[PDB]
Design an enzyme around this catalytic site. Structure first.
Site, short mmCIF file in Angstrom:
data_model
loop_
_atom_site.label_atom_id
_atom_site.label_comp_id
_atom_site.label_asym_id
_atom_site.label_seq_id
_atom_site.Cartn_x
_atom_site.Cartn_y
_atom_site.Cartn_z
N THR A 1 -7.49 109.88 -67.74
CA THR A 1 -7.68 109.39 -69.09
C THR A 1 -8.94 110.02 -69.79
O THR A 1 -9.75 110.78 -69.14
CB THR A 1 -7.80 107.84 -69.06
OG1 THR A 1 -7.64 107.33 -70.38
CG2 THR A 1 -9.10 107.39 -68.51
N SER B 1 -4.33 105.21 -67.88
CA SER B 1 -4.65 104.78 -69.24
C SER B 1 -3.99 105.66 -70.38
O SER B 1 -2.75 105.75 -70.50
CB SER B 1 -6.15 104.71 -69.40
OG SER B 1 -6.71 103.72 -68.54
N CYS B 2 -4.82 106.34 -71.18
CA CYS B 2 -4.35 107.01 -72.36
C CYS B 2 -3.54 108.25 -72.02
O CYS B 2 -2.92 108.84 -72.89
CB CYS B 2 -5.51 107.36 -73.25
SG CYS B 2 -6.33 105.87 -73.96
N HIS C 1 -8.22 98.07 -62.90
CA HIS C 1 -7.68 99.14 -63.77
C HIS C 1 -7.45 100.48 -63.05
O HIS C 1 -6.48 101.19 -63.32
CB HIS C 1 -8.55 99.36 -65.04
CG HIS C 1 -7.98 100.37 -65.99
ND1 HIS C 1 -6.73 100.24 -66.55
CD2 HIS C 1 -8.49 101.52 -66.47
CE1 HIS C 1 -6.48 101.27 -67.33
NE2 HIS C 1 -7.54 102.06 -67.32
N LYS C 2 -8.35 100.78 -62.12
CA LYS C 2 -8.32 102.02 -61.41
C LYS C 2 -7.65 101.90 -60.04
O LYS C 2 -8.31 102.08 -59.01
CB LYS C 2 -9.76 102.53 -61.23
CG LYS C 2 -10.49 103.00 -62.47
CD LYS C 2 -9.69 103.92 -63.39
CE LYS C 2 -10.57 104.45 -64.52
NZ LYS C 2 -9.86 105.44 -65.35
N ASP D 1 -5.92 93.90 -64.22
CA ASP D 1 -6.50 94.95 -65.06
C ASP D 1 -7.28 94.29 -66.19
O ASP D 1 -6.72 93.59 -67.01
CB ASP D 1 -5.34 95.81 -65.59
CG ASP D 1 -5.80 97.02 -66.42
OD1 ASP D 1 -6.80 96.92 -67.21
OD2 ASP D 1 -5.13 98.07 -66.28
#
Lengths: 258, 258
Positions: free
Chosen positions: B11, B80-81, B236-237, B208
């Site tokens: 990300t 993510s993005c 999240h990771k 998350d």
């Protein structure tokens, strides 16, 4: 137990990241830690072709030392070639240095030329394996040799006993670097008033497969440190294979030198 | 049991280094892995101020696909993005792509603007805490918003359950980044024959602390993936806190999609 301010200095091609485990270990014990990127290293924005000497390369250490509020001293710890950063910095800021710690690292002296220990390393370890070399021309016409360290070198010689996770990290962030050897060979010697006078602690292992034992004993015999700590086992990257060991040695360093 | 070529895409602000644990875990099963830095990210030589769109930001993925020989297929895994990188690449190189895996990730569609999922993410999580914002003008007059992610956000929202060593790593190599949102909002929609047609596997956790449970479930319902894997716990990771579980799921993606 003294609490101290360590400034951690990576070797050429590496960056602050090499210290990602040692830094929080020193902090659990209440130390202040600064891990700096040198020029064209880690996530420093410069490229190596914009850097003209090992002294320029040391800019972020020097700049950091200039801003350090007075009365404050630091313990500078350097791996591999960062021994040279320590000597450069002690000649500019002897006042602010409690001690320099040499972590499987070059140990310059004041008798010979600053490139002296580099020369001796390259005699000791002349075959850099799958390492690639390149040159550019510096500000005053000197041919600067740069290197991209080989992945097989990285695996076997620097990161011998490290985790795959750590070896893989290192391939993900390794960057070009330089010894600026021929520029070192022309530089005034390190001084007795500055570098010569700081306390010096040397840390090593005989299991290091790049800074070899005969070379590392030769260094210790050439310029006797105040303290020598020999770690058993591990590898060249003791801050990764012997983190707690090193954290405990550094505590003894802070205990003796504040 | 199929071996694949995984292409791992971090990300924004991050770099290839985020996959340092997942890469060797995958390689242990016999998969080939490629972990790339996007522009101005990881150790890429560029800064963000020379990057004019999310598509330019994608160059090293696009260049990588461009250079693959015919007959060779990859599975792109994005965090993510990086969901946007997957879409962008898949519209250009559908023939080299076996599947796209979304890892706590933006899941674009073909029926709204490419900015839609970023807008909905920002509704869900408007407050990015100690994150700093800056701007520059791109080559065509737009205002680009960039960011340095805050350390508190990194600690608590992104790297919630990660190790002190991993968290320290992140602080040591994190870089400025940008969503290129205003630009995304003027971008043509992702195509059915490209992005639209790839296999899509969505991997997520309800622990998350930045891509929140409702935002992620909403993604799942707005554009139904081929498969949904929900990992228990983690943060999240997941490629860091649930590395082996993610490696195991990726094996199955390789089994389905070859």
């Amino acid at each position: 137990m003294v609490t101290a301010h360590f400034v951690l200095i990576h070797t050429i091609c590496h960056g602050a990241w090499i210290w990602h485990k040692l830094k929080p270990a020193l902090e659990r014990a209440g130390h202040k830690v600064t891990a700096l990127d040198m020029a064209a290293s880690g996530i420093d924005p410069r490229q190596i072709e914009q850097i003209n000497s090992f002294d320029e390369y040391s800019e972020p250490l020097l700049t950091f030392l200039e801003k350090l509020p007075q009365g404050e001293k630091v313990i500078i710890v350097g791996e591999s070639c960062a021994g040279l950063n320590i000597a450069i910095a002690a000649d500019r800021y002897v006042d602010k240095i409690a001690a320099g710690v040499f972590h499987n690292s070059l140990l310059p002296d004041t008798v010979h030329s600053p490139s002296y220990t580099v020369e001796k390393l390259l005699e000791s370890f002349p075959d850099w394996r799958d390492t690639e070399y390149f040159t550019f021309t510096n500000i005053t016409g000197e041919t600067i040799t740069t290197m991209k360290l080989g992945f097989v070198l990285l695996r076997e010689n620097l990161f011998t006993k490290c985790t795959d996770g750590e070896y893989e990290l290192a391939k993900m962030v390794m960057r070009p670097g330089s010894l600026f050897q021929n520029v070192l060979a022309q530089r005034p010697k390190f001084t007795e008033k500055g570098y010569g006078s700081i306390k010096k602690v040397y840390i090593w292992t005989d299991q290091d497969k790049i800074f070899l034992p005969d070379f590392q004993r030769w260094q210790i015999a050439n310029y006797k440190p105040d303290k020598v700590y020999q770690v058993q086992g591990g590898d060249h990257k003791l801050q990764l294979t012997k983190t707690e060991e090193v954290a405990h040695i550094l505590q003894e360093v802070a205990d003796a030198y504040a």
